[PDB]
Amino acid sequence: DAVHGKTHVFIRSIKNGSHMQEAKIDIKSLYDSLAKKYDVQHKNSYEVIYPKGYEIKVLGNKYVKLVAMSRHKTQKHLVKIVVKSEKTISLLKKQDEVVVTTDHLKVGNYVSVYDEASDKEVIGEIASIEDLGMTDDYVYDCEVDDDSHAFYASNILVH
């Protein structure tokens, strides 16, 4: 389990105790940015950043600390997951998509989805899963300060 670099995440950063900024940013962009600010630890093939004063939106539509972030090359296939939701406004149908790696979730399962326009969490259904094949690109991982161990990845809750 990692996510593709174009995965979107909701990030808050804090400075000087008193100032905070929040934005929706791609995870590769977040990584490259933090790479200038902090610096990478290394394991067998992981490059890891332990940022301070960063937070990420997770289950419960709340921001918790982003404790670490990493990237690595992977042998695993990229898998595109499409998730549908809807609300009555008269039906507004929505879908979101996230590309993850995994060696391991099922079409038909329900998953939590962040409805950004109404700033609330809704139930989504996995509508499709597609094997996109192997990749040469880096894939990314977050550790989040929440016992859900999950964060919203392009509006879809992922672990």
Author numbering: -1, 1 to 15, 15A, 15B, 15C, 16 to 85, 95 to 109, 128 to 182
Show me the paper's own sentences about this structure.
To this end, we genetically fused the IntN and IntC precursors, each with 10 extein residues, with a 3 amino acid linker (GSH). Ser1 and Asn183 at the splice junctions were mutated to alanine to block all splicing activity. We obtained protein crystals in this format for both the wild-type sequence and the cysteine-less double mutant (C111A, C165A) and could solve these at resolutions of 1.85 and 2.6 Å, respectively. Both structures were virtually identical (0.185 Å RMSD, root mean square deviation), consistent with the negligible functional impact of mutating the non-conserved cysteine residues. No sufficient electron density was found for a part within this region, D86-S95, suggesting it is mobile or less structured, as well as for the termini represented by extein residues (except Asp-1) and the ultimate N183A. The last well-resolved amino acids, Asp108 and His109, show a conformation of the polypeptide chain that departs from the canonical intein structure. As a consequence, His109 is placed in an unusual position, remote from the scissile bond, which is incompatible with its usual catalytic role. Trying to explain the unusual functional and structural detachment of motif N3:10 residue His109 from the splicing pathway and the intein's active site, we noted in the crystal structures that His68 is positioned in the vicinity of the upstream splice junction.
